[PDB]
Design a protein around this nucleic acid. Structure first.
Ligand SMILES: Nc1ncnc2c1ncn2[C@@H]1O[C@H](COP(=O)(O)OP(=O)(O)NP(=O)(O)O)[C@@H](O)[C@H]1O
Ligand SMILES: Nc1ncnc2c1ncn2[C@@H]1O[C@H](COP(=O)(O)OP(=O)(O)NP(=O)(O)O)[C@@H](O)[C@H]1O
Ligand SMILES: Nc1ncnc2c1ncn2[C@@H]1O[C@H](COP(=O)(O)OP(=O)(O)NP(=O)(O)O)[C@@H](O)[C@H]1O
Ligand SMILES: Nc1ncnc2c1ncn2[C@@H]1O[C@H](COP(=O)(O)OP(=O)(O)NP(=O)(O)O)[C@@H](O)[C@H]1O
Ligand SMILES: [Zn+2]
Ligand SMILES: [Zn+2]
Ligand SMILES: [Zn+2]
Ligand SMILES: [Zn+2]
Ligand SMILES: [Zn+2]
Ligand SMILES: [Zn+2]
Lengths: 703, 703
DNA sequence: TACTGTTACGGCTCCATCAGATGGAGCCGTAACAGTA
DNA sequence: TACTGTTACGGCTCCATCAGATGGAGCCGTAACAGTA
C-alpha cells in the first residue's frame, strides 16, 4: 500500500522518512535545488532498477548503465520502475528521428531481410555465389542490417561520411540520403530506405499497412511489421504525425523532442510498476500538457503508481498526493516540509508552493500597460522553415511575449530571423540569417543579447565562477598581489584547469575516482592536497586574508561582501545574487548542479552584460525548471530592465510570465506545417477578446 | 486481479483461454507433454519479460537472451516476471561454485582494488611506475580483475590452462589454484584468492565479517563487502553452508545444484512481480521440499504471484489454485481440463491428477515383500568422497531402494563404487573405481546396466529413432531392399545427418532458419524438398509401401504394427511403447521434446537391452519430471523385470517408488560432510519402526 | 588608452549510436575388436 | 558364424563465462583584433 523510505541521506537530504502511497498520482514540488530529483530519481528509481536487473543476465547488466546504490537504510514496498529523467542534451549530427525512436533499426532489418536488390546502373534485378549484375559488371556486397546505416563505413556515403551535408549544402552525391548508391538500390514496394524515411509518419504508417507481399516474405516480416506499426502509431497518437523519419534530431524543437521521448517509454501496458517522470512539461504548450495529463491518468488507471516531479500548476491541480520539500534550497533545504492533498498544501502555512497556490504570494499584474512609444521594427516576407510569408512589427521599449503551440514557428520567427539579422548588423557576427525580405528599424537599437533554450553543458572542469566569467577577474586580482608579483606567478597559475599551480595527485579534480569494471565508479577524496585542488606554494599567496581555495569555497552572499571595491566582480556577483543563487558555493562543480540552478547560471551569464540604454533582450523559454518564486524574481528583474528603457521579447509558454506582458504576438493556429500565421497581435486584453486561439481563451479564463 | 490469456496457441495448445489469479499460489499440473511449460514459461514469462526489457537500454537487450514473441492474441494483467526454467545442463570443467553464484567476480574485484601485492620469490612487499620488487628483479604486471580469473590467458595457470587438473591428478604447478604464481601473491588479511576460495562458506562469511581494514579501504570496499556478505548469507540460509567456493560445478549433486540455482534468483525482495518456477523439486528430499515451500510462501507473502509447474503431491497440497492440462499428452492434449481448489480437482472426474490424488487410481503395494533368497553382495571400507568407512550388503533378486537427504552419499556409494566396480569386472570397462577395500559376491551376477541422473543432450540432429538406436536397424532394412541394392544405395544414404542422400537446400534440417541480429531467429519451412529432409532419388525407394520420410513421420503405435516381423526393431519399439511414448512421432527433434519425454527416451534406451536372467539394474532418480501415471508405468515395468529374476536398485526420493520396494538402505543422518553413515537397513516396515531418520517417519506416516 | 565584443586553436569531458566470441561437453555416424552362444 | 558390448575419430550443436569503442558537441584557457567612449 505504501513505499516506506527511512534514512534517506543522498546528496542534500537530511535523513528524511517519507511514505509514498502506491497506485496514486503523487507529485514532488518545492523550490529549485531543494531535493526533488535526489529524492525520486537518484534514490527510488535507482533502488527499484538495481533490485530487478540483478535477476537478469550478468553480462548485460554492464551495458544497462547501472545506477550507484543510494545512501539509504532500507526501502519497503518497492517495485520495478521505468523513469524518464529531466536531463536532455540532444544536438547530435549523427542522430535522426529514426534512430532516436529506434524505428530505423527495424527498417534496416526489414530491408536486409525481404528487400529486393538491383544494380544502380541499369535497374535490372541482381541474381546470384557472387551477388552481382552480369550486364554492368558490378559486384554488390552482402546484404546485412549494418550496410543500411550511415554510422559505419560499410553503409555510409563516402563523400559526407554519413552526415548528409558537406556554406552548408546537401551532399552532391547522396543528396541527403547519407548512404552509398549500392545500399540505395534495395527497394520494398518500389521505394528504397531513404524514400521510405522521407515519407511523412502518417503516410508511412498507411504505406506499411497497405503493402502487398508474398506468402514467403510475410512469414519473415510478421515480427517486424507489427513492431514498426506499433511505434508509428505511438508517434501519431502523441501528436507528431507531420514529422519525417529523416529529420535530424539537432533541429527538433523542445516540445517535439520531449514528446518523442515521452511516447517511446510509456507504451508498454504493464501493471504494478512505478513510473517516475522528472519535469515532464518542458517546452510544452498548455494543450500539450492537458493531453499528457490525460495520457498519464490513463496509464495510472491500469494499476500503476506515478511519481512526477512537476513545477507546473496544472499537474499539481490534477493529483491525489503532494510531497513538498524545502523549506529553502541547496544546503538550506532537504526536509519534507508538507504533505497531503492539494487543499492541505494550500492551507499549510509552512509550504511556499502552497502559499503561491493560495494567493498569499503572487506575481503583480500592472494596472496600466506600457503603450508603445511610436518606435517599431518590422519584418516582411518571413518564410523561414514553415512560416507562410507573414509580416509582423515588433514594438520597442515594452515587454513583448511570443506565444503559440509547439511547432507554430515561434523559434523560427524570433530566434533565427530576428537574432541572426540583429547580430549580423550590430555585433558584426558572421552568421547566415533566415529566409526573409528585409527588416526596417535596425537603426533604432544599439546591441542585441540572446538566451537560447538549449540546456547548458556539464563537465567537472567548470563551476559558476568560470561559467559567469568572474573567475578570470578573481584570478587577475590574485595575480596582482605583491607576493605573487615577487614570486613570478601569473593568472594561469591560479587556475586548477592549467598545469603548474594545481595538485598533481588529482590534476585539479580534488577527488580521485576509482574505476570499477562491472559496477558504478566510486569517488573518494584526495590525500596529497586534501581536496584543495592546489599545492602548498599556491595556497601561501593570500589576498585580504584568504587564499584561492578559501575564495573558491565561499557562497555568493559571502563573496558579495568580500568583493565590494571591485566594480566588475561586484556587478557579476550581484547579478548572480539577483537571479536567485545566493546560497550555492562559488566552486560547486557543474555536474552536481540541478537543472534549475544550471539554467539560472546560464541566465546570469548573459543578464550581467552592460546595457547601452537601448538594447534588445531575446529570451527563449527562460522559465524552464524554475519554481514560481524563481519566476517571480526573473519577472521582476526583466521588468526593471524594461523600465530602464530597453526592449525585451520572451518566447514563453508560462502563463504568469505572459499575463504581465505589454504586447503579445501569437503564432499558430496549429503546430507543424499547418501553422505559421499570426493568429492575434495586441495587448493581453485584446488577445483575450479573440476566441480563435487557445492562448486567448486561457488568458481570458485567468483574468 | 486476474491474468487473462486469450487465444494461446503456442506449441500444442488448442487456442485455450485461462484466467490466472494474481497474488496467489497457482500450480500447473498434468501429464508429461501436456503443455504446462508451453503455457507458463514459453508464453507468460516470455510476454512479461518482452514487455519490460523494451523500457531499458537498446544495446543491452541483445545480451539478455530475448524470447520469441508467443503465438497469442493478447494478455491482460501482466507484470514483470523472473523465472527459473526446468532445463539444467551444468557439467562444465571451467565453472565452479564461485562463478555460478557470481561471488567470484566480486572477489576478483575486491582483490584487484584493495589487495596487497608481494613478490612470490621472497615475500617482500612490492612497491613502485612498474610494480616490481627490486630485490629479486621480478616485474609484476598490472592489477586488474581479469588477472584473477582462470578463463583468460592473463590470469590462468600456464600448465593446466586454468583447469586445475592435468590419470587425473591435481596440477603440479598451481596445486589446483588454477591461477599463476604472480596472481596468487595478492593477499587480503593474510590469504590470497585461492585460500579464501578454499575456505568453507560458513567460515568465509565470518572471515569477511571480521576483517580489519583501514579507513581508506573501507570506503572503496563498502559496496563490495555488503554484496559478498548478502550472497554468502543466501547460500548459508538455503542449507548449503558446508560447500567451498572452489568446488567444481561438474561434481555438485542434483539437489545441491538446484538449491544453488534457487537461492540466487529469489532474494531480491520486490513487490508486484510474477515468479515462475518450472519443476522446482528435482533431486530434493522431502525436508528440502518443505523448506522450499516455506520459503516460497514467505516470498508470496510480500505481495507476489507464483506460477509453479509441479508434479509433487506436497506442492499441490499447499496451493490455492490448480490449473490442470490434458487430458492426454503430445497432440492428444493441450486444453484446460480442470481448474479450482485442490478439493475441486479431487472431485473432478475428468482430471487424471485428481483421480490419482483422490485414490481412484493408485500404485499397488504388495501384500508380502520378496524376502532375500540367501544371495548377497557386500562392500567393505566404503570411503569414497564423504563416506565414513561403512559396510553394507546389497541383496540380490529383490527391489532395493537407496534413500537419504541430499549430500548423504547415495550417489557416491551406489553409483561410483558399485557401478564402476561391476562394469570393470563384468563389462571389461576401463574406469577407475572409488576408494574401497573389496566387494564380495561379483560372481553372482552376469551384467550391469545403469541409468545416470544427468539430463540428456539436446540437438536438432537427433530424434528418438536415433537415440534409441532403432534408426540404424530401420536404415539397414531400407538399404536391404532390391531397388536400393540395384541402385547401389547403402545405409549411409538413408540418414539425414550424412551428405549424399539428403536435401542439400537445408542439409537435412528440414526447415531453414533466417538469422536476425537483435531479434530472436525465425524458422521457416524449406522449399526445395518441402521439409522431407531427402531428395527425390531417395524417396523413390519404398519398403512395404512407405518411403523413409513416411516411416520417419509415423507415431510409435503405428510403427509397432508396421514393424512386426523384425525382432530387434519390434523389441525396441515395444520398449518405447511401454515406457509411455506411444503418441510421439518417430522423428520429432530432440530440442522440441519436453523434459519428461526426454527422460523417458533415456530410460527406454537402456531398458531395451537384453537381460541375461541375472543382471544388475542401477537407476539414479528415474522419476524426475514424470507424472504419477508415468511413475506407475515405470514401477510396473521394473517390478516385471524383478519378477523375471533380476536385481534392481533405485536411488529415488519419490515416496511412491519407495513404498513398493523390497529392501531399503538409508544413508544419513544429515547432508554434506556430516553424513555417510547407514541410519537404517531393512524392510519398509522395519525402517518405519525407526524414528532416527525422516524417511522412516514419512514411511510410517503414509502407511 | 582601456573596456567590451568577436573569432580561432588546443585539451578535457559527456552523450548518442552500434547489435558477441571462445572453450568444452554431448550426440551421430562409422570403423575396429573382443566375448559369447 | 552372428549378436552384443566396448573404444577411438571426425563433424555439428549447445551451454557457460567474460565486463565497451567511436564520433562529435560543449566548455575552459589563451591569444589576436576591431569598435567605442
Ligand atoms: N553530487 C552532488 N553532490 C553534492 N550536492 C549535490 C549533488 N547533486 C546535487 N546536489 C545538490 O543538492 C541540491 C538538490 O539538487 P537536486 O535534488 O538534484 O535538485 P532538484 O530539487 O530536483 N531541483 P531542480 O532540478 O532545479 O528543479 C542542490 O543544491 C544541488 O546542487
Ligand atoms: N531545419 C529544419 N528543417 C525542417 N523543419 C524544421 C527545421 N527546423 C525546424 N523545423 C520545424 O519547423 C517547425 C517550427 O519549429 P520551431 O519554430 O523551432 O518550433 P517552436 O514553435 O519554437 N516550438 P517549441 O520550441 O517546442 O515551443 C517544427 O515543425 C519543426 O520541426
Ligand atoms: N517447438 C515445438 N514444436 C512442436 N512441438 C513442440 C515444441 N515444443 C514442445 N512441443 C511439444 O508440445 C508438447 C508439450 O510440451 P511442453 O509443454 O514443453 O511439456 P510439459 O507439459 O511441460 N511436460 P514435461 O516437461 O515433460 O513435464 C509435447 O508433446 C512436446 O513434444
Ligand atoms: N569430487 C568431489 N569432491 C568433493 N566433494 C564431493 C565430490 N563429489 C561429490 N562431493 C560431495 O559429496 C557429497 C555427497 O555427494 P553425492 O553422493 O553425489 O550426493 P547425493 O547423496 O546423491 N545427493 P542428491 O543427488 O542431490 O540427492 C556432497 O556434499 C557433494 O557435494
Ligand atoms: Zn547492371
Ligand atoms: Zn554523401
Ligand atoms: Zn589532490
Ligand atoms: Zn622479491
Ligand atoms: Zn596449473
Ligand atoms: Zn530442404
Amino acid at each position: 500500500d505504501y513505499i516506506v523510505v527511512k534514512g534517506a541521506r543522498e546528496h542534500n537530504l537530511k535523513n528524511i522518512d517519507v511514505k509514498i502511497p502506491r497506485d496514486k498520482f503523487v507529485v514532488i514540488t518545492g523550490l529549485s535545488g531543494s531535493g526533488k530529483s535526489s529524492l525520486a530519481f537518484d534514490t527510488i528509481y535507482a533502488e527499484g532498477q538495481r533490485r530487478y536487473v540483478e535477476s537478469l543476465s550478468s553480462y548485460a547488466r554492464q551495458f544497462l548503465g547501472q545506477m550507484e546504490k543510494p545512501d539509504v537504510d532500507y526501502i519497503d514496498g518497492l517495485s520495478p520502475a521505468i523513469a524518464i529523467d529531466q536531463k536532455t542534451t540532444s544536438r547530435n549530427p549523427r542522430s535522426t528521428v529514426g534512430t532516436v525512436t529506434e524505428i530505423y533499426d527495424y527498417l534496416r532489418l526489414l530491408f536486409a531481410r525481404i528487400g529486393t536488390p538491383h544494380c544502380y546502373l541499369c535497374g535490372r534485378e541482381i541474381s546470384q555465389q557472387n551477388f552481382a549484375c552480369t550486364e554492368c559488371n558490378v559486384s554488390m556486397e552482402e546484404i546485412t542490417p549494418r550496410m543500411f546505416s550511415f554510422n559505419n563505413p560499410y553503409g555510409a556515403c563516402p563523400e559526407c561520411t554519413g552526415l548528409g551535408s558537406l556554406s552548408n549544402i546537401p551532399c552532391p552525391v547522396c543528396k541527403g540520403a547519407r548512404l552509398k548508391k549500392e545500399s540505395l538500390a534495395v527497394t520494398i514496394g518500389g521505394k528504397n530506405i531513404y524514400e521510405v524515411c522521407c515519407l511523412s509518419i502518417g503516410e508511412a504508417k498507411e504505406f506499411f499497412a497497405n503493402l502487398n507481399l508474398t506468402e514467403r516474405q510475410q512469414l519473415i516480416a510478421r515480427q517486424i511489421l507489427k513492431e514498426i506499426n506499433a511505434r508509428l502509431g505511438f508517434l501519431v497518437d502523441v501528436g507528431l504525425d507531420y514529422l519525417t523519419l529523416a529529420r535530424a534530431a539537432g533541429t527538433l524543437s523542445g516540445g517535439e523532442a520531449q514528446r518523442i521521448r515521452l511516447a517511446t517509454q510509456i507504451g508498454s501496458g504493464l501493471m504494478g510498476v512505478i513510473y517516475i517522470l522528472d519535469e515532464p512539461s518542458i517546452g510544452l504548450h498548455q494543450r500539450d500538457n492537458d493531453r499528457l495529463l490525460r495520457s498519464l491518468k490513463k496509464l495510472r488507471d491500469l494499476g500503476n503508481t506515478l511519481l512526477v516531479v512537476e513545477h507546473d500548476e496544472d499537474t499539481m491541480y490534477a493529483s491525489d498526493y503532494i510531497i513538498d520539500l524545502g523549506p529553502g534550497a541547496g544546503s538550506h533545504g532537504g526536509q519534507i516540509v508538507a504533505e497531503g492533498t492539494v487543499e492541505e498544501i494550500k492551507q499549510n502555512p509552512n509550504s511556499v508552493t502552497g502559499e503561491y497556490l493560495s494567493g498569499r504570494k503572487k506575481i503583480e499584474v500592472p494596472k496600466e500597460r506600457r503603450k508603445p512609444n511610436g518606435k517599431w521594427l518590422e519584418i516582411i516576407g518571413a518564410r523561414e522553415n514553415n512560416l507562410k510569408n507573414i509580416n509582423v512589427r515588433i514594438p520597442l521599449g515594452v515587454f513583448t511575449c511570443i506565444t503559440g503551440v509547439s511547432g507554430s514557428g515561434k523559434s523560427s520567427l524570433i530566434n533565427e530571423i530576428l537574432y541572426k539579422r540583429l547580430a549580423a548588423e550590430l555585433n558584426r557576427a558572421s552568421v547566415k540569417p533566415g529566409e526573409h525580405d528585409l527588416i526596417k528599424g535596425i537603426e533604432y537599437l544599439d546591441k542585441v543579447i540572446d538566451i537560447d533554450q538549449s540546456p547548458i553543458g556539464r563537465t567537472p572542469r567548470s563551476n559558476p565562477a568560470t561559467y559567469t566569467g568572474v573567475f578570470d577577474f578573481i584570478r587577475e586580482i590574485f595575480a596582482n598581489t605583491t607576493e605573487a608579483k615577487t614570486r613570478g606567478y601569473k593568472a594561469g597559475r591560479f587556475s586548477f584547469n592549467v598545469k603548474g599551480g594545481r595538485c598533481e595527485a588529482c590534476a585539479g579534480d580534488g577527488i580521485n575516482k576509482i574505476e570499477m569494471h562491472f559496477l558504478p565508479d566510486i569517488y573518494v577524496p584526495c590525500e596529497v592536497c586534501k581536496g584543495k585542488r592546489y599545492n602548498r606554494e599556491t595556497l601561501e599567496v593570500r589576498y585580504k586574508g584568504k587564499n584561492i581555495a578559501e575564495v573558491l569555497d565561499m557562497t555568493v552572499e559571502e563573496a558579495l561582501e568580500f568583493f565590494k571595491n571591485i566594480p566588475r566582480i561586484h556587478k557579476k556577483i550581484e547579478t548572480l545574487y539577483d537571479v536567485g543563487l545566493g546560497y550555492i558555493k562559488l566552486g560547486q562543480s557543474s555536474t552536481t548542479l540541478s537543472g534549475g540552478e544550471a539554467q539560472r547560471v546560464k541566465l546570469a551569464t548573459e543578464l550581467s552584460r552592460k546595457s547601452t540604454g537601448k538594447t534588445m533582450y531575446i529570451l527563449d523559454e527562460p522559465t524552464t525548471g524554475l519554481h514560481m518564486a524563481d519566476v517571480h524574481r526573473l519577472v521582476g528583474i526583466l521588468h526593471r530592465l524594461v523600465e530602464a528603457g530597453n526592449s525585451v521579447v520572451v518566447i514563453e509558454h508560462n502563463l504568469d510570465v505572459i499575463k504581465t506582458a505589454d504586447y503579445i504576438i501569437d503564432l499558430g493556429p496549429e503546430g507543424g506545417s499547418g501553422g505559421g500565421l499570426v493568429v492575434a497581435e495586441g495587448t493581453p486584453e485584446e488577445v483575450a477578446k479573440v476566441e480563435n486561439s487557445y492562448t486567448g481563451q486561457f488568458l481570458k479564463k485567468v483574468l
